[PDB]
Amino acid sequence: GPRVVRIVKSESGYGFNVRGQVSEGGQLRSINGELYAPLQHVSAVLPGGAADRAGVRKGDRILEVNHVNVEGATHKQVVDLIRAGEKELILTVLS
Amino acid sequence: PLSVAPEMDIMDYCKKEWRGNTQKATCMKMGYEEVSQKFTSIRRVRGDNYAALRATLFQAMSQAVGLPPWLQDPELMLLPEKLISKYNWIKQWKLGLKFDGKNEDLVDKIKESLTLLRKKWAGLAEMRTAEARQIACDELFTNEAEEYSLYEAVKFLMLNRAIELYNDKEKGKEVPFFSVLLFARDTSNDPGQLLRNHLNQVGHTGGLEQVEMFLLAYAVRHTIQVYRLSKYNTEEFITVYPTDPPKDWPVVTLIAEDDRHYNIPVRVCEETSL
């Protein structure tokens, strides 16, 4: 279900990986019995990093970043949004 | 009844279709972890005798941003009459289970199938977005007479190419290696034997053989790149038809879990660390 996890920039970075569609796309898929446009997902986590300690799990699909709905967003949209934050990162993810 | 099921994330497909840690499921999932480096999702292809043809055509047509020159070529629809007239044995053509006709009508049924292929491809190539094309293909691949008419067209194009390759071989021209293998089979020594004992049987007693994948690729001038999950950790894990693909041919990627179960990867991905 939806989970709002918070992670803080180490000077190393947030410490996972994000992977998802490059192009704009809205085709709906069934996830957990509900329909969603394509979602970016966590492709890797850094053991002993901010993401691992904070609670982000590999495979978690991202629904929001800093309260902004990224459902159906492009990879650059979410990445750029990730990098908009000064300090902190707030993610709403589905596990 | 979509013959190509709707999109599903690879993460969800494996969670559902390849549960457990048996060596088989583990192998499939490590294979899908490779597919997952380039795509996020897959669509399951109907596992009938046309599976390889359906996966290839769905991918090629849903990626169509233009009408390929060999399909746009207006001389293409003269090919059925010119070939059947030159080679009357082609009238041993066996129709798919969804059609029937008397051999007099063979020429115009093939021309009808070729016209359908061209029209659908042109229609898809005119649409502005890839998502719009996939929806249009979804309406096309409903397992009805139109979808299966396309296979009659492609199969006829495969026969024509095989005829051209055989003729080149006998005249002494250079031919691609796969053609030697194709006609080296005791059941397919010549194009007629290829028609009666293999092409005619796709849709009735089996699907395309491995080396007929080359013929299909040459027939629609598409490079067919197949993730063969059963051959993970080997050179054949990713097999390509043709083995040396021309740089101008468009590429379609398939996933063959086994030789009868095909998925198509969709939604190209890219990864960023953070």
Q: Report the C-alpha gap between B273 and A18 in whole angstroms.
A: 6
**Contact A42/B at CB under 8 A:** no
Residue whose token pair is 């993730």:
B227
Residue A48 is part of which domain span?
A: 1-95
Helix B51-62 and helix B130-140, axial crossing angle in degrees, nearest 10: 140
Tokens linked to B178? 């796969």
Residue B58: phi and psi, rounded to 5, are -55, -45
Q: Report the C-alpha gap between B178 and B182 in whole angstroms.
A: 6
- How many Cβ pairs within 8 Å bridge chains A and B? 68
C-alpha closest to that of B107 among B124, B84, B73, B123: B84
Strands A88-94 and B39-44 turn out to be unpaired
C-alpha closest to that of A37 among B64, B124, B40: B40
With beta carbons less than 8 A apart as the criterion, state whether A90 and A70 touch. Answer: no
Alpha helices in A1-95, H assignment, sequence order: 50-54, 75-84
Q: Report the C-alpha gap between B242 and B233 in whole angstroms.
A: 21
Question: How far is CA B237 from its chain centroid?
Answer: 18
Q: Report the C-alpha gap between A18 and A41 in whole angstroms.
A: 6
Peptide linkage before B242 cis (omega within 30 of 0): yes
Q: Report the C-alpha gap between B202 and B151 in whole angstroms.
A: 10
A31 to B40: CB separation less than 8 angstroms, yes or no: no
**Contact A91/B at CB under 8 A:** no
A15 contacts in chain B (CB < 8 Å): 274
A19 to B271: CB separation less than 8 angstroms, yes or no: yes
- Domain of A81, CATH number, reads 2.30.42.10
Experimental method: X-ray
Q: Report the C-alpha gap between B163 and B169 in whole angstroms.
A: 10
Q: Report the C-alpha gap between B10 and B220 in whole angstroms.
A: 28
Q: Report the C-alpha gap between A12 and A14 in whole angstroms.
A: 7
A90 contacts in chain B (CB < 8 Å): none
Q: Which SS3 state, helix, strand or coil, does residue B135 take?
A: helix
Strand partners, B270: A20
Q: Which SS3 state, helix, strand or coil, does residue B237 take?
A: helix
The contact set of B with A (CB < 8 A) is: 6-9, 11-12, 36, 40-41, 130-131, 134, 267-274
Residue B22: phi and psi, rounded to 5, are -55, 150
Q: Report the C-alpha gap between B258 and B103 in whole angstroms.
A: 36
A59 contacts in chain B (CB < 8 Å): 11
Amino acid, single-letter form, for residue B75: E
Residue whose token pair is 């699907």:
B207
Burial letters for B35-52: b for 16+ Cβ neighbours within 10 Å, e otherwise?
bbeebbbbbbbbeebbbb
Number of separate domains in chain A:
1
Partner residue facing A17 (CB), from B41, B131, B271? B271
Data resolution in angstroms = 2.0
Strands B251-256 and B223-228 turn out to be parallel
With beta carbons less than 8 A apart as the criterion, state whether B264 and B58 touch. Answer: yes
Tokens linked to A19? 């992977």
Partner residue facing A14 (CB), from B41, B268, B274? B274
Give chain B's largest Cα–Cα span. 66
